[PDB]
């Protein structure tokens, strides 16, 4: 369908116990393809899927030099933020950025992303029109005035519309077997009666990709309630994901309700009921 | 593929 590529930087100051720590990770869709960790021996953009290992010597040396200079830049970025917030150096802080781009089935460019968070909060993000920034506070405003004078957005747009897309298409084509697959969800139902008066109905989606799912309980027609609970989608660790949804009910009342699964894979959205 | 230039805050 439409696919995406996101890199995620994370820098964390370590007053007294060295220079800050930089960790970056690459993803296409819900599938991680590289990693760099500044504390590691290797000092290199390392591969993280068996399909990205086929890219030639140049790719590795190129990517290492960049993610290495990404780290020296987000290093000094922590230093500036300190000063913008007049915070004491003895304190430890966290700068995360996230960027990347998206394409349709036409393989054509769709959306860019370029966002920063300081200490777990939005700082500055490039609008979907890629000419402007949203500043979260009056320090971001300082950044927003420099970046508008610099013409950062015009330059970053060129990267996103260009090298970012080019990258993504190659990965979708070298990695087609992995990245361009739908794994349908395997769906079973457990029942654990809490007492003789009431029982628990758990709706299981296992071993499906990508992560996006919508699991919906209902009784005798439509039912959306906080009587229902959902655990956040979790990774199985083999490249598929898991989710379960539970609902509680009276006894001998198990067929009044059904569970409904939507996923990219399934030609038809399913229904699940309890057989003793 | 990565960028070759990153903004300063």
């Amino acid at each position: 369908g439409s696919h995406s590529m996101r890199y995620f930087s994370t820098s964390v100051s370590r007053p007294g116990r060295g220079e800050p720590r930089f960790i970056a990770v690459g993803y296409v869709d819900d599938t991680q393809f590289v990693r760099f960790d500044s504390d590691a021996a290797s000092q290199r953009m390392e591969p993280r899927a068996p399909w990205i290992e086929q890219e030639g010597p140049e790719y590795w040396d190129e990517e290492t030099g960049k993610v290495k200079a990404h780290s020296q830049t987000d290093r000094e970025n922590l230093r500036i933020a300190l000063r913008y917030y007049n915070q004491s150096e003895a304190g430890s802080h966290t700068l995360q950025m996230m960027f990347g781009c998206d394409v349709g089935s036409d393989g054509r460019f769709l959306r860019g992303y370029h966002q920063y968070a300081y200490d777990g909060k939005d700082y500055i993000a490039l609008k979907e029109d890629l000419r402007s920034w949203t500043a979260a506070d009056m320090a971001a405003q300082i950044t927003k005035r420099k970046w508008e004078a610099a013409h950062v957005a015009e330059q970053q747009r060129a990267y996103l519309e260009g090298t970012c897309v080019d990258g993504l298409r190659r990965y979708l084509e070298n990695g087609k077997e992995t990245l361009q697959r739908t794994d349908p969800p395997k769906t079973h139902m457990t029942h654990h009666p809490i007492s003789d008066h009431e029982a628990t109905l758990r709706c299981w989606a296992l071993g499906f990709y990508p992560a996006e799912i919508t699991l919906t309980w209902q009784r005798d027609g439509e039912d959306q309630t906080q009587d229902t609970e959902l655990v956040e989608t979790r990774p199985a660790g083999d490249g598929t994901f898991q989710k379960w949804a539970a609902v509680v009910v009276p006894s001998g009342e198990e067929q009044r309700y059904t569970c409904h699964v939507q996923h990219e894979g399934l030609p038809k959205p399913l229904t699940l009921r309890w057989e003793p | 593929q990565l960028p070759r230039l990153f903004p300063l805050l």
Partner: T-cell receptor
Amino acid sequence: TGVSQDPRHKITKRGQNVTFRCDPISEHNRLYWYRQTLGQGPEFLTYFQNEAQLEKSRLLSDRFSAERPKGSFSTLEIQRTEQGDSAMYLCASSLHHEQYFGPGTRLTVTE
Amino acid sequence: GEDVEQSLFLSVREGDSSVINCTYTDSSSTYLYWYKQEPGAGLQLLTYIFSNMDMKQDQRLTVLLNKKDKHLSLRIADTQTGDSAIYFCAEPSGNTGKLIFGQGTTLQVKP
């Protein structure tokens, strides 16, 4: 406004030492030195991201040293100046991608 | 490995269109400059295009880019004897914002 550079001309004896100054445009975190010999286009020397000297060249010898203490003005010491180093020593500064150049220091090294 | 190639010298008549091409080194370069040097010391930014643009007009200046061929060209529609100077095309290189320059095209304009 515009980048500044001391001094705009320099004459040294061969093997004396020489220091150029460059003040970039206010609030410009990136600073680059180039040299250019007449007839040619400029060759990159060294790069500063505030106080930190993050790139140098094979070109740059033991003799060559640059410093940007305080993250502002930069210096370029050239030691044991041989005639070979007779050249225009240019300074550029940028908020992000756009470099603005100085008027440069024309250095003549004579025996 | 390789370098930003342009012509050393171009001659042209008052009111003709001067056209400096160069071929740059890497597709991934997001921006490309023309700088200008008159007789003296001052290297002055003229204009630049972004890699996601075909054309860019600016008074008498026009800039064309073909990313596929890594081909960049500067065009000057009426040409004056004042337009005479050295014209350098300049490409980013690596992960700094550092520039590699062409050898520079001298524009002799004939009365």
